[PDB]
Amino acid sequence: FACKTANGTAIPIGGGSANVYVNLAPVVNVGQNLVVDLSTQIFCHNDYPETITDYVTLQRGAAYGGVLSSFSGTVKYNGSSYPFPTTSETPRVVYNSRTDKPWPVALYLTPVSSAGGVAIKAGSLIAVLILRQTNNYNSDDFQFVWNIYANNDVVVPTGGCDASARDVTVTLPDYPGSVPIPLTVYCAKSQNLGYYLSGTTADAGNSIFTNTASFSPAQGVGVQLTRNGTIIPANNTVSLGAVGTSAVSLGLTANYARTGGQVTAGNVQSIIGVTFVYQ
């Protein structure tokens, strides 16, 4: 039992791993199905069909990169559909010829709600599919690991400039401490973007946002947002500049800041607004 890719790379008897490079639809939208048909690239055959019958399965299938974070999916195997990423071993396909035949595997991937812009970037790992080979002869249990990579960028249609999320909540370590804030932006057409913060501050510099908490609130402290090592006062335009189909981080970091008194224990909460400026 051996396998081979359409682009040369093969896996001999005993199992092993191989990198597959697939072409993907450069544009796929919500409701539409991105199809990664692997029955045209991964092939397998039986080396001793006169004495041994091979049994092959899609043992496990995992999603990576943009598929894991922007796509919901199912997998086609020998005519039947299963959840993707897989959660159970599929029924077996019989291999009984020396003639290399297609491994009946297809990926059906639909964009999620948060998808937009470059969902799957070029050269990135999109999937890992584990083939499992056995037989009625031996007790051979071989694994053929297939690392599915995208050859090209896959763009989810977007209109204008859209942000990562609308509600981003970040939790701080116990005082004192800091946290990165996962916030991105992508534009359909490359546009010059800026942004400013909004809210209620406690300091003259208008940078330390007040602890809005009204449960067990901690006094003395507040939250201060920083970027590139520099504190960002409220109502202060930070220009990101050229922003296109690739996500551009706002580079925000939540910190504790001192009001001008003495810190007491309790909850801390600040609601900070982000507003984008165009051109």
Binding site: A165, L172, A218, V221, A254, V274, T275
Partner: peptide
């Protein structure tokens, strides 16, 4: 705001 950031913290004793 286009995005609202909620920042949860806590001070222990």
């Amino acid at each position: 705001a286009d995005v609202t950031i909620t920042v949860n913290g806590k001070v222990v004793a």
